Design a protein around this motif. Structure first.
Motif, PDB file in Angstrom:
ATOM      1  N   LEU A   1     -69.445 -15.893  11.230  1.00  0.00           N
ATOM      2  CA  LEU A   1     -69.578 -16.310  12.622  1.00  0.00           C
ATOM      3  C   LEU A   1     -68.244 -16.277  13.357  1.00  0.00           C
ATOM      4  CD1 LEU A   1     -72.095 -19.145  12.073  1.00  0.00           C
ATOM      5  CD2 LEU A   1     -72.438 -17.055  13.341  1.00  0.00           C
TER       6      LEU A   1
ATOM      7  N   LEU B   1     -67.242 -14.220  16.942  1.00  0.00           N
ATOM      8  CA  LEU B   1     -66.408 -14.563  18.102  1.00  0.00           C
ATOM      9  C   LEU B   1     -65.268 -13.569  18.265  1.00  0.00           C
ATOM     10  CD1 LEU B   1     -66.996 -17.788  16.924  1.00  0.00           C
ATOM     11  CD2 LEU B   1     -65.479 -18.316  18.796  1.00  0.00           C
TER      12      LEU B   1
ATOM     13  N   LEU C   1     -66.546 -10.651  19.953  1.00  0.00           N
ATOM     14  CA  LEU C   1     -66.852 -11.007  21.326  1.00  0.00           C
ATOM     15  C   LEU C   1     -65.609 -10.932  22.200  1.00  0.00           C
ATOM     16  CD1 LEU C   1     -69.316 -13.747  22.185  1.00  0.00           C
ATOM     17  CD2 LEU C   1     -67.043 -13.975  23.120  1.00  0.00           C
TER      18      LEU C   1
ATOM     19  N   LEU D   1     -81.309 -18.041  16.646  1.00  0.00           N
ATOM     20  CA  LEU D   1     -80.220 -17.090  16.774  1.00  0.00           C
ATOM     21  C   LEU D   1     -80.691 -15.743  17.286  1.00  0.00           C
ATOM     22  CD1 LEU D   1     -78.134 -17.872  13.620  1.00  0.00           C
ATOM     23  CD2 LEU D   1     -77.428 -17.990  15.966  1.00  0.00           C
TER      24      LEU D   1
ATOM     25  N   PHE E   1     -75.191 -24.689  12.938  1.00  0.00           N
ATOM     26  CA  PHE E   1     -75.250 -25.039  14.346  1.00  0.00           C
ATOM     27  C   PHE E   1     -73.865 -25.139  14.966  1.00  0.00           C
ATOM     28  CE2 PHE E   1     -79.492 -26.502  13.126  1.00  0.00           C
ATOM     29  CZ  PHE E   1     -80.214 -25.885  14.110  1.00  0.00           C
TER      30      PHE E   1
ATOM     31  N   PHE F   1     -70.843 -24.325  14.269  1.00  0.00           N
ATOM     32  CA  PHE F   1     -70.110 -23.078  14.405  1.00  0.00           C
ATOM     33  C   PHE F   1     -71.025 -21.906  14.711  1.00  0.00           C
ATOM     34  CE2 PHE F   1     -67.094 -25.562  11.917  1.00  0.00           C
ATOM     35  CZ  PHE F   1     -65.906 -25.262  12.542  1.00  0.00           C
ATOM     36  N   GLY F   2     -72.253 -22.167  15.146  1.00  0.00           N
ATOM     37  CA  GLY F   2     -73.179 -21.093  15.439  1.00  0.00           C
ATOM     38  C   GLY F   2     -73.749 -21.179  16.832  1.00  0.00           C
ATOM     39  N   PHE F   3     -73.818 -22.388  17.360  1.00  0.00           N
ATOM     40  CA  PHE F   3     -74.188 -22.626  18.744  1.00  0.00           C
ATOM     41  C   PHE F   3     -73.110 -23.379  19.495  1.00  0.00           C
ATOM     42  CE2 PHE F   3     -78.894 -22.340  17.637  1.00  0.00           C
ATOM     43  CZ  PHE F   3     -78.889 -21.018  17.997  1.00  0.00           C
TER      44      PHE F   3
ATOM     45  N   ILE G   1     -70.003 -23.665  19.091  1.00  0.00           N
ATOM     46  CA  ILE G   1     -68.769 -22.949  19.363  1.00  0.00           C
ATOM     47  C   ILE G   1     -69.017 -21.497  19.740  1.00  0.00           C
ATOM     48  CG2 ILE G   1     -68.000 -21.938  17.174  1.00  0.00           C
ATOM     49  CD1 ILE G   1     -65.904 -24.158  19.411  1.00  0.00           C
ATOM     50  N   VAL G   2     -70.180 -20.933  19.443  1.00  0.00           N
ATOM     51  CA  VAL G   2     -70.434 -19.525  19.686  1.00  0.00           C
ATOM     52  C   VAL G   2     -71.224 -19.317  20.952  1.00  0.00           C
ATOM     53  CG1 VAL G   2     -71.430 -17.430  18.747  1.00  0.00           C
ATOM     54  CG2 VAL G   2     -70.400 -19.079  17.255  1.00  0.00           C
ATOM     55  N   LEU G   3     -72.322 -20.046  21.092  1.00  0.00           N
ATOM     56  CA  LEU G   3     -73.325 -19.660  22.067  1.00  0.00           C
ATOM     57  C   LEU G   3     -72.882 -20.026  23.473  1.00  0.00           C
ATOM     58  CD1 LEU G   3     -76.318 -20.015  23.621  1.00  0.00           C
ATOM     59  CD2 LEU G   3     -75.856 -18.151  21.998  1.00  0.00           C
TER      60      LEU G   3
ATOM     61  N   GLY H   1     -69.612 -18.059  24.313  1.00  0.00           N
ATOM     62  CA  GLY H   1     -69.987 -16.704  24.654  1.00  0.00           C
ATOM     63  C   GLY H   1     -70.689 -16.617  25.990  1.00  0.00           C
TER      64      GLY H   1
ATOM     65  N   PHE I   1     -67.942 -16.732  28.426  1.00  0.00           N
ATOM     66  CA  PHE I   1     -67.011 -15.631  28.281  1.00  0.00           C
ATOM     67  C   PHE I   1     -67.607 -14.338  28.799  1.00  0.00           C
ATOM     68  CE2 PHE I   1     -64.461 -12.539  26.056  1.00  0.00           C
ATOM     69  CZ  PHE I   1     -63.210 -13.101  26.098  1.00  0.00           C
TER      70      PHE I   1
END
Ligand SMILES: CCCCCCCCCCCCCCCCCC(=O)OC[C@H](COP(=O)([O-])OCC[N+](C)(C)C)OC(=O)CCCCCCCCCCCCCCCCC
Ligand SMILES: CCCCCCCCCCCCCCCCCC(=O)OC[C@H](COP(=O)(O)OCCN)OC(=O)CCCCCCCCCCCCCCCCC
Lengths: 319, 347, 459, 55, 46, 119, 54, 98, 140, 102
Positions: free
Chosen positions: C32, C36, C39, C439, J41, J43-45, J47-49, J52, J55
């Motif tokens: 993950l 990023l 990204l 996801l 979650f 580190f998957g939502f 921090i990511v979702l 992003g 961004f």
């Protein structure tokens, strides 16, 4: 191991650890008759090392921990279940027979390695020749499909025909009813469930086939029933035996070099043990074998090279 | 056998092949091929079974008549312009007889009938040594005398050896026959580009030799003759499986792997000429000889055949063959892809 | 770009030197993190591509596919447990490292410059797919699946090498720029026809086109879930990416020599949407669905409009997400009952009352519900092909109708009307499958809001 | 009818039958010697004079 | 301890490990010296 | 392409090879070679049942040393071979001006190439 | 655990002397597993000479 | 062309076809190999004599001694095959099938 | 041999006809004798009448395919009056494959032979029509 | 009189529940499964979702969009304010062109 050509070039030959005591004496007898009694007597008198009986878990005995590894691995033989019921469709005659064949072959190789390495000759009891006679009488009972006997004929043709047969063979003849009385004297109920016609067919094949086919390869001395202890007579007979025939008089040195470099690396010996023919009484699918191999890795003293084996030590892995 | 005598016989094989590499006189090259035969005969019949005896008989007959037809080619060369310098020849007929002698010598499509029969009834060490030096000895000669060869000879024998070692090859589980037909297919490839750039031929010779040494070393680690024996090698040990996977795929030549690199350079310096249809035919048949590799991999390490106990016995002994040098040859042979410009290390 | 290559390498010895209950957190967390990390890439602007070295570069065709790859790895790596957690530790570690090497060659492939390097990384993309699907192919014909797989892909992709070497030594080097700026038109001699035929036919095999789609269904019905998601999304859109690049050369004969392939693709699109209306083996319906969308992709590639290439890349990314999600849902249902058949496992509006929400959402994306991306793709491709001809819209609309009906049949067949009430073993939904659905369908709707990113070079 | 049985019998099965039959007539040769040397002789004659290689 | 009647080896032999590490240090130092001479020769000629 | 002074014996690295730039320390190709050597020592542990990453550290250091050395010599030879190929090419360029004529740059104000639109 | 594995009959499909059966390849017997035949011991007697009365 | 060379080359094809087609005994094949050896010997000797190629006139005797020791090896191989079998036919060798 | 294949291709094609079919039958006789020679070397017929029979079957069939190829070559060249296509020889290869399947008396072999012989014949004439050399440059 | 097999009767259907009723995704190790949930979650939502989402919600003008808006604004205002026709055809100068002749 310090071998190959280079040991044979540093050391001159290997015939120097010979003879008149470096020899193979082998007591062949019927069950509960020709045993470690007379074998230990002649081994202690004659000045010559001894081998105990080839059990089930001999392969577990000869490496690292000599405790028997549990019989999920070394099995699935169950010799007491063989003396109980030699008729099960799960298959317990021939699986046991292959296992004891491999056990006799390994301990024979260990014996012949101890002969050709430094001497000083050994005794064996119930060798591989007695093992095929044993199985052919077991088939005379009719517990085994004949195709499985054809498999045994195949394995016997491949493996034995690279070795030297032993020097002398002491046959012990005891009649049926005395062996019957002795197995009643021991009192083990699984052993008490033996039947006598099985023992009779053992004596039949063991006289009629073994004796014509040894024939001065493995020169024999035939002894009677109470002819046991009786130690001085058989020591004396070996003392004036006059070795007459056999391939042992023709080596001269070169076959002995091949046998030293063959009997070491016992896995090279056993590269003919699993041939296979696939014998639906014998073989094992992928799943059971895989979980048994992973549980065999889970032992604390068998895993990844017993030389470098950690969790017994050894504090030399160069930090 | 004495070990001193085996060191002697290896000395004479090496002497014979170095004579073939090093000399400039025609008599010396013919001496080199004959002494190569005489020394390699008692490496076979290392045991005394009659299989090895019939194999050595067939090998001696075809090898010796290739030797004498080679001598016929040399005496034709002196029937015409007569000097003993290994150079351009001076007869198309002499060059025809001479390349047919070498095609009998190293195994080739009209002449390959002794290769599976010579490999099937011999042990593994004999097969390894005959593949190495009996494919290495004539390549020096052909690399020399390339500038006077009618091309259709070389190209015909290359194409037909590639497709024979293809189509013959789908039928054998005798692993010596599989490896022998593999030898035929790669020798077709290595004969092919002789008249275009011989750097590719010699690089392919290096790669092929190292690959077959890895394969035969893996078979000598645990003596097998059939694929079912390889399935027992799956059960008893796992790292042998992934090695059989990697080395079979690098015999197969896939572009992540190092066995692809000899195909690719051949197709390059072939297709800089007007030869395009011949490359795509060669590489389709290179797709063909991967299939028995693939069914062999399916036998060994990917599906699993049912095993036998006494493997339970063989668990208690850790392995104790010596490999001569297996791992070094393996990752010399398989991870070699980012060193393609070690092409030009060779000329 | 080596800033993306080298942690993807160093995620591999990670997985070796972790232990039991320790590999998993490291792999998933760090993958993950790499998502990023890529990204961060999307900078691409204006004049040209952006060059990550003297060797690597990124077209804006390559940026969304590359980000999709680094998105799809941790999803996959979570998805492929509970069907192998009871196997051995060493084999499990080998599985994870196999997928990481796979992703590494996919990044190598998408960020190519030289088409020969692209070809090497194409078949290096191939070889882990083989090993995964054969070692965990989980049914009795994984043998035949891998065999068909590798021989179609190589023996189609083999002469592509010959054509590219020939172009190499007739027109200098093979930058995509020096493939551009120097390409001169090539007329209608038959050698040109065969050269075009070689390149386009190899990628046709990898799409699939219609006459070579029986490559596919064995290679997805007898795969594990990881290799199936990999194979569908990344490999089919990788083949499309390859044709999208190398169609820059050989425009002056693609008109004369493109007529049979379009017609093959159209009648095969109709036939494939028809053949996925009646099959059992629910897993295979997604495979034939994938052939239908890729046939529409091929129509969009052989017509050469900027409209067509915008529609093509949107259809690529949306179908990749739809098919990868829907494979994961079908694996959830097969974890429930040991069937894989269609008409068996029924009911399930009652039980697991929110698994059906994800089935509904994916089924409406595969319908091309209109704010989603898949309708954007299909709509612009239909616009471009109607400017191609005034007649093809019969085929496109009939594709829309039959696509609606089989997708709705997938929805209301297995998950509507009556549970068979001799099941009595299905568990209520784990958190894991809910996480996997989450996801998938957050980024699809989030691109449904702002889709100016994912359109192609011809934006 | 169309996809399964005809498309498998046009692209794979033709290849598989061709390769299988050609294996079973190339390498299905029993092991004598006189065959191999007659094959050598006819190859030499048919390479020298018929489809010539030295002219 | 724990190993009946033989280990084939297991105590580390001391000629071989010291010999290999001595010759490895020797080969490192030799290629370093050759390399430094090569750098000096290149810069000295050009 | 052929030797080109095989006259002038085999000569693994000529004494004209001490003008080229040598391969530097930690150049990436021999770094790859050392990685291959580390992996070779690691599989060398792995073939037999001796455990990975440990109890073979002298063998790992050995294989690292030997492969990095052999790769170093071959890198020097490789650089020499490309240098001699480039210099022979330019010498045959300068040796005959008669057959490689100067293509005068027809700039694109006058060069005619047709269109053939993709509708 | 439901991951399929081949059987004895699969292995015997890959068993035998050659791979593909024809009309002709019934006579291809498997090789001996030791690469050693049980050869003919064709020496029935030694050299027997009847020296008569000459 | 020194006319006789035609006959010795035709004699070489005689010996070569006698080496290739051969019916029953391996000994006839090996002896025709020996005949081929004699043919090459003679032809090369005639050319080296009439060339006065007097420095390297070793070719006849050294070609001779080498291919004669080849024939010695062939004799031993035929003895070994005849020892482990009854006869030395080309038949009774059909084992080890290709 | 080069002489008779050169005689076949030296005819303008074009129509100079029935020399084309005679040359094609000579090709067929040669190729049948080649492959039959390998077969009679590698089968041992016993009786020898069977050996002559097998060689006669091979020569006769290869000559038949050569004749039928040349016949429909000549006829299609005269009728279409466009001697430059490979389509007329595509008809040629399919007709030759059909009568191959006729003289072996099964129809699937005739079908696959139609397909492959047609594709090879179109490629042969087409490669002559562009010009792809026999086996080599062998220059650079 | 035959079996052909020797292995376990298969499968062994482990309900992953009915030893943990609180269980998240994978097998019955209690705490590290909760760590799996927390990492996939947080580190998957977490921090990511949403990061992003910010961004890619905005960054500069991807493929020069609003640059082109304002540049076209200024150019069309210039070509109105100096009379000349907006969007001159023949984008290259016909003085710098050379037609080949007949
Ligand atoms: C399908 C085969 C693709 C082979 C590679 C593509 C190619 O150039 O084919 C042309 C090839 C050969 O054509 P070619 O490439 O020789 O084209 C002529 C090139 N000059 C003029 C330089 C000689 O076609 C075939 O081989 C047919 C198959
Ligand atoms: C446009 C591009 C089209 C490319 C097409 C390429 C060829 C098609 C794929 C070839 C492989 C097909 C395949 O996998 O067939 C399965 C078959 C084996 O099936 P079966 O006979 O059941 O064997 C069971 C063994 N126990 O496998 C076989 O019988 C394999 C037969 C050989 C095939 C090798 C690959 C093709 C080579 C063609 C050369 C001409």
């Amino acid at each position: 191991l310090q071998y190959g050509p280079l040991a044979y070039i540093l050391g001159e030959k290997t015939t120097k650890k010979m003879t008149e005591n470096s020899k193979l004496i082998t007591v062949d007898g019927n069950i509960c008759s020709g045993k470690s009694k007379l074998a230990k007597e002649v081994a202690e008198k004659l000045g010559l090392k001894h081998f105990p009986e080839a059990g089930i878990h001999y392969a577990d005995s000869t490496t690292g921990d000599g405790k028997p590894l549990p019989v999920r691995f070394s099995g699935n033989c169950s010799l007491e279940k063989f003396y109980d019921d030699p008729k099960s469709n799960d298959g317990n005659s021939y699986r046991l027979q292959a296992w004891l064949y491999a056990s006799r072959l390994l301990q024979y190789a260990d014996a012949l390695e101890h002969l050709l390495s430094t001497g000083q000759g050994v005794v064996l009891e119930r060798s591989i020749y007695s093992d095929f006679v044993f199985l052919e009488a077991m088939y005379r009972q009719g517990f085994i499909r004949k195709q499985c006997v054809d498999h045994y004929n195949q394995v016997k043709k491949v493996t034995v025909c690279e070795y030297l047969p032993p020097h002398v063979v002491i046959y012990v003849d005891v009649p049926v009813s005395e062996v019957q009385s002795r197995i009643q004297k021991k009192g083990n109920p699984h052993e008490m469930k033996i039947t006598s016609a099985y023992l009779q067919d053992i004596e039949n094949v063991y006289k009629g086939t073994f004796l014509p086919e040894m024939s001065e390869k493995c020169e024999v001395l035939q002894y009677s029933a109470w002819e046991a202890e009786d130690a001085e007579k058989v020591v004396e007979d070996i003392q004036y035996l006059k070795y007459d025939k056999g391939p042992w008089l023709d080596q001269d040195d070169r076959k002995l070099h091949n046998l030293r470099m063959l009997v070491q690396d016992k896995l090279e010996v056993l590269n003919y043990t699993s041939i296979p023919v696939f014998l639906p009484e014998v073989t094992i699918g992928a799943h059971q074998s895989d979980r048994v191999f992973q549980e065999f890795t889970e032992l604390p003293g068998r895993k990844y090279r017993a030389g470098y084996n950690e969790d017994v030590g050894d504090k030399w892995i160069w930090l | 056998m004495n070990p001193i005598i085996l060191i002697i016989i290896l000395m004479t094989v090496m002497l014979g092949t170095i004579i073939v590499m090093i000399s400039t006189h025609w008599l010396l090259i013919w001496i080199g091929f004959e002494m190569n035969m005489l020394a390699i005969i008692p490496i076979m019949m290392k045991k005394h079974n009659p299989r090895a005896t019939e194999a050595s008989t067939k090998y001696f007959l075809t090898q010796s008549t290739a030797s004498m037809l080679l001598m016929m080619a040399i005496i034709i060369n002196l029937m015409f312009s007569g000097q003993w310098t290994v150079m351009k020849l001076f007869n198309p007929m002499a060059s025809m007889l001479m390349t047919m002698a070498l095609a009998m010598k190293l195994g080739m499509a009209p002449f390959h009938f002794w290769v599976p029969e010579v490999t099937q009834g011999i042990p593994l060490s004999s097969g390894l040594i005959l593949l190495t030096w009996q494919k290495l000895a004539p390549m020096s000669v052909l690399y020399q005398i390339l500038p006077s060869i009618n091309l259709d000879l070389i190209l015909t024998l290359s194409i037909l050896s590639i497709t024979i070692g293809g189509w013959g090859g789908l039928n054998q589980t005798q692993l010596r026959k599989i490896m022998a037909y593999s030898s035929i297919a790669h020798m077709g490839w290595m004969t092919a580009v002789l008249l275009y750039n011989p750097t590719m031929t010699l690089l392919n010779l290096i790669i092929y030799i190292i690959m077959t040494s890895t394969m035969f070393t893996l078979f000598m680690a645990n003596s097998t003759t059939t694929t079912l024996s390889l399935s027992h090698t799956w059960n008893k040990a796992p790292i042998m499986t992934i090695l059989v996977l990697i080395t079979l795929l690098s015999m197969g030549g896939l572009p992540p792997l190092s066995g692809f690199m000899p195909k690719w350079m051949i197709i390059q310096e072939m297709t800089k000429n007007d030869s395009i249809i011949l490359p795509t035919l060669m590489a389709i048949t290179a797709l063909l000889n991967l299939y028995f590799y693939m069914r062999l991999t399916y036998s060994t390490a990917l599906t699993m055949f049912p095993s036998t106990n006494n493997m339970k016995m063989k668990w208690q002994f850790p392995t104790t063959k010596r490999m001569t040098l297996l791992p070094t040859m393996t990752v010399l042979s398989t991870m070699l892809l980012p060193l393609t410009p070690i092409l030009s290390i060779l000329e | 770009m080596l800033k993306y290559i080298i942690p993807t390498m160093m995620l591999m010895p990670l997985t070796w030197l972790s232990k039991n209950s320790m590999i998993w957190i490291n792999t998933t967390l760090h993958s993950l993190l790499i998502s990023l990390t890529s990204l961060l890439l999307l900078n691409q602007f204006g004049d040209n591509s952006l060059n990550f070295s003297l060797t690597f570069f990124s077209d804006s065709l390559s940026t969304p596919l590359l980000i999709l790859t680094m998105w799809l790895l941790p999803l996959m790596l979570m998805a492929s447990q509970h069907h192998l957690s009871k196997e051995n530790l060493a084999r499990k570690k080998l599985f994870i490292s196999m997928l990481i090497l796979l992703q590494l060659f996919l990044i190598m492939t998408f960020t190519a410059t030289e088409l020969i390097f692209f070809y090497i990384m194409f078949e290096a993309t191939l070889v882990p797919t083989l090993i995964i699907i054969t070692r965990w192919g989980n049914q009795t014909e994984r043998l035949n699946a891998g065999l068909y797989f590798l021989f179609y892909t190589l023996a189609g992709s083999l002469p592509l090498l010959v054509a590219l070497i020939y172009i190499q030594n007739t027109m200098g080097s093979l930058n995509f720029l020096i493939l551009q700026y120097w390409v001169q038109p090539m007329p209608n001699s038959w050698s040109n026809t065969f050269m075009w035929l070689a390149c386009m036919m190899a990628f046709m095999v990898k799409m699939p086109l219609y006459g070579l789609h029986l490559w596919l269904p064995k290679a997805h019905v007898e795969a594990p879930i990881a290799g199936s998601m990999v194979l569908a999304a990344i490999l089919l859109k990788l083949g499309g990416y390859g044709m999208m690049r190398i169609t820059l050369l050989l425009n002056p004969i693609t008109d004369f020599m493109a007529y049979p392939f379009i017609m093959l693709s159209l009648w095969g699109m109709i036939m494939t949407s028809s053949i996925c209306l009646r099959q059992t083996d629910l897993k295979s319906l997604i495979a034939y669905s994938s052939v239908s969308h890729m046939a529409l992709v091929i129509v969009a590639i052989l017509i050469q409009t900027p409209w067509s290439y915008m529609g093509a890349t949107a259809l690529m990314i949306a179908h990749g997400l739809t098919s990868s999600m829907l494979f994961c849902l079908a694996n959830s249902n097969y974890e429930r009952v040991h069937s894989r058949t269609m008409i068996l496992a029924r009911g399930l509006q009652t039980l697991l009352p929110l698994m059906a929400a994800w089935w509904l959402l994916a089924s409406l994306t595969n319908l091309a519900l209109p704010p989603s991306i898949n309708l954007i793709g299909e709509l612009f491709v239909v616009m471009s092909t109607f400017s191609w001809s005034n007649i093809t819209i019969i085929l496109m609309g009939l594709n829309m109708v039959i696509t609606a009906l089989y997708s709705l049949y997938m929805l209301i067949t297995t998950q509507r009307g009556k549970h068979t009430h001799h099941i009595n073993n299905i568990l209520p939904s784990f958190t894991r499958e809910n996480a996997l659905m989450s996801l998938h369908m957050l980024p699809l709707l989030l691109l449904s809001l702002n889709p100016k990113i994912i359109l192609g070079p011809l934006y | 009818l169309l996809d399964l049985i005809w498309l498998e019998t046009i692209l794979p099965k033709t290849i598989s039958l061709a390769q299988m039959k050609m294996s079973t007539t190339i390498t299905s040769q029993k092991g004598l010697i006189k065959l191999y040397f007659l094959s050598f002789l006819i190859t030499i004659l048919i390479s020298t004079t018929l489809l010539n290689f030295h002219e | 301890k724990f190993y009946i009647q033989e280990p084939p080896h297991g105590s580390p032999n001391w000629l071989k490990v010291g010999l290999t590490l001595g010759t490895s240090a020797f080969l490192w130092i030799y290629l370093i010296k050759q390399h430094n001479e090569d750098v000096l020769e290149y810069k000295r000629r050009n | 392409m052929t030797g080109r002074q095989a006259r002038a014996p085999l000569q693994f690295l000529p004494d004209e090879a001490r003008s080229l730039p040598p391969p530097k320390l930690t150049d990436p190709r021999l770094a790859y070679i050392g990685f291959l050597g580390y992996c070779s020592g690691l599989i060398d542990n792995a073939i037999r049942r001796r455990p990975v990453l440990s109890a073979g550290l002298h063998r790992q250091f050995l294989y690292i040393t030997s492969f990095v050395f052999v790769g170093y010599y071959l890198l020097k030879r490789q650089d020499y071979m490309y240098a001699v190929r480039d210099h022979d090419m330019f010498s045959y360029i300068k040796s005959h001006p008669e057959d490689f004529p100067e293509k005068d740059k027809k700039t694109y104000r006058e060069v005619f190439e047709e269109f053939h639109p993709v509708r | 655990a439901r991951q399929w594995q081949p059987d004895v009959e699969w292995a015997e499909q890959y068993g035998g002397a050659v791979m593909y059966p024809t009309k002709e390849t019934a006579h291809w017997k498997p090789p001996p597993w030791n690469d050693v035949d049980p050869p003919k011991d064709t020496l029935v007697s030694n050299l027997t000479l009847n020296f008569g009365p000459q | 062309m020194s006319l006789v060379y035609m006959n010795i080359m035709m004699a070489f094809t005689v010996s070569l076809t006698g080496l290739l087609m051969y019916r029953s005994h391996l000994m006839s094949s090996l002896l025709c190999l020996e005949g081929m050896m004699l043919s090459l010997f003679i032809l090369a000797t005639l050319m080296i004599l009439n060339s006065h190629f007097t420095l390297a006139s070793m070719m006849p005797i050294i070609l001779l001694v080498f291919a004669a020791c080849e024939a010695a090896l062939g004799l031993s191989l035929l003895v070994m095959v005849s020892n482990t079998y009854g006869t030395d036919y080309v038949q009774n060798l059909n084992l080890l099938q290709c | 041999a080069k002489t008779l294949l050169h005689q076949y291709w030296d005819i303008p094609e074009g129509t100079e006809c029935h020399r084309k079919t005679y040359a094609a039958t000579s090709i067929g006789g040669a190729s049948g004798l080649v492959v039959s020679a390998y077969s009679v070397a590698l089968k041992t017929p016993t009786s020898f009448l069977e050996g002559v029979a097998r060689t006669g079957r091979y020569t006769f069939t290869a000559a038949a395919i050569g004749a039928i190829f040349g016949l429909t070559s000549c006829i299609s060249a005269q009728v279409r009056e466009k001697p430059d296509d490979p389509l007329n020889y595509l008809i040629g290869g399919c007709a030759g494959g059909l009568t191959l399947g006729a003289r072996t008396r099964s129809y699937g072999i005739g079908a696959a032979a139609c397909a492959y012989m047609g594709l090879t014949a179109a490629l042969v004439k087409m490669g002559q029509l562009e010009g792809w050399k026999v086996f080599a440059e062998p220059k650079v | 009189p035959t079996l052909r097999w020797q292995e376990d009767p298969e499968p062994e259907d482990e309900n992953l529940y009915e030893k943990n009723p609180d269980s998240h995704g994978y097998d019955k190790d209690p705490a590290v499964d909760v760590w799996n949930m927390r990492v996939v979650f947080f580190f998957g939502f977490s921090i990511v979702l949403v990061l992003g989402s910010t961004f890619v919600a905005y960054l500069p003008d991807y493929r020069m969009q609003e640059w082109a808006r304002r540049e076209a604004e200024r150019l069309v205002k210039y070509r109105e304010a100096h009379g000349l026709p907006l969007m001159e055809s023949n984008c290259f100068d016909p003085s710098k062109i050379q037609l080949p002749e007949d």
